Amino acid sequence: QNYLFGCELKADKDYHFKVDEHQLSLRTVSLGAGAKDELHIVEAEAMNYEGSPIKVTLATLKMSVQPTVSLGGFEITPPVVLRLKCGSGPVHISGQHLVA
Amino acid sequence: QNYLFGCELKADKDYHFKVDEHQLSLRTVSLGAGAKDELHIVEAEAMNYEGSPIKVTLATLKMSVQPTVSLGGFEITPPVVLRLKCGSGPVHISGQHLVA
Amino acid sequence: QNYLFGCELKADKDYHFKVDEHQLSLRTVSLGAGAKDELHIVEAEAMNYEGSPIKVTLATLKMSVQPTVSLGGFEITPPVVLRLKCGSGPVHISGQHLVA
Amino acid sequence: QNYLFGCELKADKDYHFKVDEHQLSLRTVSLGAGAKDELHIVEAEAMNYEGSPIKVTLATLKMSVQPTVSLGGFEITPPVVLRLKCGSGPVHISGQHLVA
Amino acid sequence: QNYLFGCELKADKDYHFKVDEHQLSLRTVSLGAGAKDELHIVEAEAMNYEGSPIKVTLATLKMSVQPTVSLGGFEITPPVVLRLKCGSGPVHISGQHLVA
Amino acid sequence: QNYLFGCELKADKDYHFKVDEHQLSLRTVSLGAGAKDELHIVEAEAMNYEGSPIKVTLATLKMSVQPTVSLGGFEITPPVVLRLKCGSGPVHISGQHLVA
Amino acid sequence: QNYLFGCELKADKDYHFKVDEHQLSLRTVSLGAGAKDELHIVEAEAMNYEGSPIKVTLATLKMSVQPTVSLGGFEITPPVVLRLKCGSGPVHISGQHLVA
Amino acid sequence: QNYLFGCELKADKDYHFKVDEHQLSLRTVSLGAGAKDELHIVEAEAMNYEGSPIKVTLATLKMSVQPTVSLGGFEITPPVVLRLKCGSGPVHISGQHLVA
Amino acid sequence: QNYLFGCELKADKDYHFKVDEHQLSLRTVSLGAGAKDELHIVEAEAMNYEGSPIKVTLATLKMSVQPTVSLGGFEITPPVVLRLKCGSGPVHISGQHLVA
Amino acid sequence: QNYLFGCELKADKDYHFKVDEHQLSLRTVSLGAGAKDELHIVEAEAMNYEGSPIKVTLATLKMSVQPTVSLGGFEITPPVVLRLKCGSGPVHISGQHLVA
What we know:
homodecamer, mainly beta, four-stranded antiparallel sheet, 8 strands, chaperone, Decamer, decameric, Nucleophosmin
């Protein structure tokens, strides 16, 4: 079963996705209306095989080159932390919350 | 069983997808032939796990950089509302209507 | 079971896809060396849930911007028609012919 | 079962995928280092449903516009031929070898 | 079962993925903060159907044109090596670690 | 003699170079920081030989294509009226006010 | 002694500049708002040193790449014809009409 | 009578060309290797006819669309200030310094 | 005393400007209607201050980057040689044949 | 009297121009056939009105953005130094040598 999901990433804020079973599918990554035409890199934080957490790069954006990146159903087992590694933002993210 | 689904969006229109075992899977978001070269942002509204409806960003389009965005089958459980978060319009949305 | 599928669209010549279950899965929609650097809109007409047929826009292409658009398997149940809403192509469409 | 696959093509060199259940799932198509900034139409030839051999376009690429098209799992039943409808090449095709 | 995966490749630096069913599903290939606006080719090395190892191109990137390529779940069987055939990045690679 | 001269143009605002000997030498026509990514056509109106005033196009600009156009001393004898044939601006004009 | 000089050119609409010393000094060639995004070539016709009349190319413009071009006072001796040897137009030509 | 002139600009600093005949002839306006891809508006401040100082826009720049702008010898009379109206540079201004 | 001057180039259609006081002022250098999107380079060969002929780059062109370049009245003393250092052509040269 | 000027510039060279009256008028700065699509910055060195030599930026170049920049008769009192502040090259320069 699935539910919509979305988050807005602003510079220096982490977006925590944890649930208090589940999986999280990432669809699109899009720059906001006010974002600066600078490089925007979006980082995701969740643990790897060997038990420890890590940061991965989902997408590298730029308004005048590539505003939106589609991941195709990138899923990560919660908890996951979404953040901008560089770039004012905002940067939108969407996908689905897969449950049960 | 899927059937073609489609909707055209533009300023002051909310396409309301409602059903009254039904799934709406989105494929493409493409700017209409009319569209000015301004930044378009398409968002979808629908419930999250907790039951509350969240506004979410499907994509950010701009005629001269990226007129179309492929979502690759983004499923959302109706009811769901689509619209332009900002941009004269028009913007086309394609996809499948999945049943039972 | 799959069979390669592809067609070419121009400014005037609709491609009809019928058989005599069967499924048509669209892959990528590209621009032909011929085509001008003008806005191309590939649309598809098929049946919706209320039995009536409808027109949906698969993609919007522009040679000097986005020559190729990929749909990652947009499945449509036949019959379906593939036409060029605007632009004159040649415009190529690949995909699979899924069967019973 | 899957194994990496890949091939390279330039202007008049076709490539032949063939074994002697089996499927070729194409992933990404991308211009390699020495490609001239000319148009690049990459195509495949394989059997359609009616039995004959059809030529189909996988992507239209241009080094300064779209150096890479991603088909994301486009499955074609061997035997299949890969070639440049036109363009000096090289053109890097990556994908998978799926087995019974 | 899935775990989050994320290498970082630089000019003559090589990433080495391996275990001790286990599958590797790549998601996005993208440029990082540094990376001068020069061509970029990311190639992968994992075994092919027969037994010999192949070098394959995952994508051709360029900062001023296309900073990100979404392979959308390109699964490769371990062990596997990711490297830049051209360019010098950094170039980030996200994906999943599929197990059992 | 040579004096500095500049103005601003925004549909909502026009310019009347009047000398109530003289010359108006135009240098650059450049898009203001807040201009939309729309098409801007700067127009100048003055006297031709035959005595009846005519409208002339000085430049055609687009922020993401060409923000500044240098006329390099396009001299015009007053009276003359600079104005935006289209685009809401603002467009800055710079140059010289030559005398005697 | 100089006066403003303009003119709007379209396919099949040669512009004749005739003076019944006198010199025509071309300033800017700029695409009109209607002008499609197809290549445009503006040519001018005045007689050469050896008597016979030549056709010369002034500028090659294209809306999405270079909407305006500064000739910077390219002076021709009348009579002279300005035409659009390529493209629909409209194309604007500004400049000065110098007199003795 | 000319001596090479030049100066660097950043949001931090201005430049004050004053001298105790003299003439300032500006040539090219260009972004430094360290300038970001933000919009850069360079302005000059010097007296007008009426005698009161005025701020004029010499050029709008953007690294990825128009790194350089050639003014072609825009002569201004000291004292003159050159500043970065918007953007942070560094931007370089070259030219000439003419004396009596 | 000026008269129109024009040229056209390809790898085998060069142009010698010789005469039997006299002066060639080059204006624009632009690519022609059907020449390929490859780099283009125009060089002119004429004697230097020490009598020996030098080879000089008039401009570097590329249809989708910059099809036209204005030299702005670049004067050279016959005999002069115009050629396409590289690039397919056609490549048009305009300017004026000055005399006495 | 004038003579053609020309020179190629590489990275960590220095092209000296001294005549042993005399003035150096610069025309077009253009990128060589094998320059990297990296950012180039051409510098010029000569005396300021106060005595000491000063470096100046003539033009910032980027192959896929601006391959050619036209200074349009930038006169410099030799001796003058012409170098590349940053860029592989080759970077061509053309102009005139004006004598006594």
